[PDB]
Symmetry: D2
């Protein structure tokens, strides 16, 4: 009930250590990240009982300026020798608590800024550019970390989660929504073949926090692989609801990644309307949503 | 966990029962709401153990369609005879749990869609129009309500909060930020006179949930009044930090409204840079603060 | 062939106040305190001598766009006038005088509006001179283009003022009937709809000097235009947005004979009645498609 | 000075006729569009002297409701038998002017709603799905058409343009910006190696309007191909300014597509700042953004 910090701390770096040696799965071609260009948007929040008088009295003696937190994060991207956004948050968190002993808790959110490769031609041969990248406004990897300083001054991870945000998938056929309650408030017709359009935010938790850092990359779960599981499962099965779809996606994730403990879904329904006069159009604003956890 | 529902359920109606008989405070001229035009954006979430098979098996037998929740909310705005957004959420929640016995929990968020009065001339007389309103994209009232059906089938409120969101205040002078840690990570200069620009989201919790509904309107705490306390407190004193500003705003709120238990702040710093005096927009990173003031903080 | 800088924000305190304005029945507007002033400027420049900056990569005659930003921001500090229109003229004249190889400059200025707030001082509640609320609602605009002619004289080549971002809903007293009903028509006749319009209004002065504030009795304030729009919308049963904006434009030109013409860009965002059968009507947000209208009213319409 | 219409007319259709047989170029693998899923956002504007009294008098007798324009567009996506967004706009325009004789002008803008393929597994083999697509918020194709009814009742295309919007490209090295004017207003340091970040909107006009419709797909210029030219040209050379980059992109486009008359660019500069406080680290700049407008002809 007393925290402060900095949001929208963007930091971009070239030639981060490549992520290599990740275990591949049948649903995904993902085998690593070259890391020629790496971007992250970090939010940092900190607290501690010794900050009380910064609120109650206007005493700034123990206030790390939020501007300085921004400098801390950006400088640490330059010195980070690891390979994942999760490991970067861990580096920032441990470093920050080691620097500022009066801080008792730090919470970090990191959002990948995704870039995609582009094509260039050199002497007749077209290939991926190592220089020119396309900024993507589509799905992106996320990471969350909370760390605390205990009364015996050890540091402990109290929460850690990885994710995939902003995935927007439409399946043109092979989706039903039937059998729901029909009463005085029901106008929705039964539909045995709708073009289901779902937004997915998927988060996962590791059994062992160390697996999230890429130290042993064979145990890392890449957001890219989660994406490709999601599209494969959506494709493979006649859907009966978004609820049951996210259940089946979660089951496949836990099957493919036994090192995970849980998968959490936040989904939204944005399915198009058939037009007034198959052609579809955008619906009115109200959107359905679902929240669901699958456990290993 | 397992929940599902509908967001962005907009509903507009004219001639909601007016809010009057409120209790005034020195910081605010607020005296009620005409309610000629009323709008709300509702989010509804529901849960219950009996919904498991809708996820695990694709059995929709016990699923209230989210489209039907949308219909339920919109129709109930037509039949609501009360005077506040908080009371509207209570009416929706109680009505919904009574209709659907297999639902164990409902969670509602309501955001006011604010409209402002405009001028019209009628027969040489300029006055506020009863017909034409301006849609506002500035601050707005909010309300939060969670309700449960207990195992013994009684219904109980499990969370209730009211709020003010989207308030953006700049104070051109009379703000200092000095005395903070200056170390190897510090490039921020001391500034004894900055144009502090804060975004405020303020939420309050009543001691007695009935006071939020408007039934006895003298016990209601209006978002307009909270707004006016925030602006007066910001004006009245030299600020030393956003942290300490929100503490003083919270203390004044709890002093003016003894029926409140606590008040929660989420603030953001958006202060302008001096240009490379004239000011300009900063880079994207923004400071923020989260703080709860309780009755234990009172004089 | 043009280049420039957008989103050049500049804020200052205690700009010279705007006073001495001429009033109209529809509006209480009496001036602007200018305790807090903000503007968002876009600048675009051109000139034949800039060709090789494109064709060859030669930057020798390029004013960096960063330097344009510095120019604008510094000139808000030295501006001694009272309107956004005048500020643009000051920037444009100053810029072309500084950079003789630039043949054309185009400026857009958007007001960043702030609203007064209440404070209690010693038991007296009054408007604060210190704390303001940033507004995301309607705002004044200004457009100015200037050229350096072949003979080195400077001339304004376009000037318009405006009001943007006005969103008005009239809950009753609106009809839309009599339109074409054919095989593409699913819209019912509606003799009483809650018409919701977005308005962007621009006006052109007969005499460009009247826009600058030098003789402030000839200035047309966006606040006054706003208040004409709300009054006219209230006063009469609307028959369409088309005819509403015609009537607003006629009133503007009648109230401000120093204006040559007024231009409207309107959009229809009227709510739908809710799907559920219903006590009074309830409305909700429509699907995304929006109607729009563009219309110019001139003195020939009076 | 008198128009009205409808914006944000979204229409989505499955199994539009595929676009096949497009001439390839070295910079791009593009050969066509499966059109399993097709989406467009249309804006329609119409005008005509016979609409005057709808404004001056409130007489709606000759008003096609904007709602009905929306119906017209959406129904015509169902009946369109062609293969390009440009051809769809031509179909809508000709059909609309043929239906409503009192309309003298129609202007259409179409924005592709882009969808990307996704992976699915069958029998352990991973391949692109024919059912599941990913909605993209990145670059997209555009088309513009203005058509008028002449006094002799012939219909005439008065403006026609195709485009690519929303392309955001960053080149990490191999970019300079030096030699610009340094005077009392200049604080920007010269930079011989910046990570240039450009937004590109690219439009092109055909020599012969018929080439935009896909009827002979060998003459069609796909926005995908323009995208890939842009990234190749950006890669290939040390840039000296955005101005000179868009010039070189335009020259390459006109070389690869001799059926084009002109290329028009609207570019923006969003290059990151080096941080205040090992390799370099960058961050987001303040809001002011540079921009350029430029036309290449031939
Ligand atoms: O997948 C769905 N789940 C739902 O709960 C629902 N409600 N309306 N449509 C729906 N679709
Ligand atoms: O009010 C402020 N509080 C802070 O914590 C801070 N940090 N930088 N600037 C600041 N301003
Ligand atoms: O005011 C309106 N003008 C129009 O042209 C129109 N078309 N549909 N609804 C409409 N309303
Ligand atoms: O490429 C650029 N062109 C410009 O005109 C400019 N001005 N500042 N930086 C710039 N970069
Ligand atoms: K009072
Ligand atoms: K008056």
């Amino acid at each position: 009930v007393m925290y402060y910090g900095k949001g929208d701390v963007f930091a971009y770096r070239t030639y981060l250590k490549p992520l290599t040696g990740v275990r591949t799965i049948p649903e995904s071609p993902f085998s690593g990240r070259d890391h020629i260009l790496f971007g992250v948007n970090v939010k940092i929040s900190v607290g501690g009982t010794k900050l009380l008088t910064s609120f109650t009295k206007g005493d700034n003696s123990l206030v790390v300026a939020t501007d300085s937190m921004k400098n801390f994060i950006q400088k640490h991207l330059a010195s980070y020798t690891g390979t994942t956004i999760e490991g970067f948050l861990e580096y920032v968190a441990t470093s920050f608590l080691k620097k500022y002993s009066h801080i008792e808790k730090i919470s970090l959110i990191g959002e990948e800024i995704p870039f995609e490769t582009t094509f260039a031609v050199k002497n007749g041969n077209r290939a991926a550019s190592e220089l020119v990248f396309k900024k993507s406004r589509n799905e992106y990897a996320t990471a969350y970390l909370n760390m605390v300083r205990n009364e015996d001054n050890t540091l402990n991870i109290t929460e850690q989660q990885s994710g995939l945000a902003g995935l927007q998938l439409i399946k043109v056929s092979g989706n039903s929504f039937v059998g729901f309650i029909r009463d005085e408030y029901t106008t929705l017709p039964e539909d045995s073949n709708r073009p289901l359009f779902v937004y997915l935010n998927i988060k996962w938790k590791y059994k062992n926090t160390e697996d999230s850092f890429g130290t042993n990359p064979e145990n890392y779960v890449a957001a890219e692989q989660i994406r490709d599981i999601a599209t494969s499962v959506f494709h493979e099965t006649e859907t009966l609801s978004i609820q049951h779809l996210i259940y089946l996606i979660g089951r496949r994730i836990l099957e493919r990644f036994p090192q995970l403990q849980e998968v959490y879904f936040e989904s939204q329904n944005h399915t198009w309307d058939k037009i007034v006069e198959k052609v579809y159009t955008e619906p009115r604003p109200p959107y359905g949503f679902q929240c669901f956890t699958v456990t290993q």
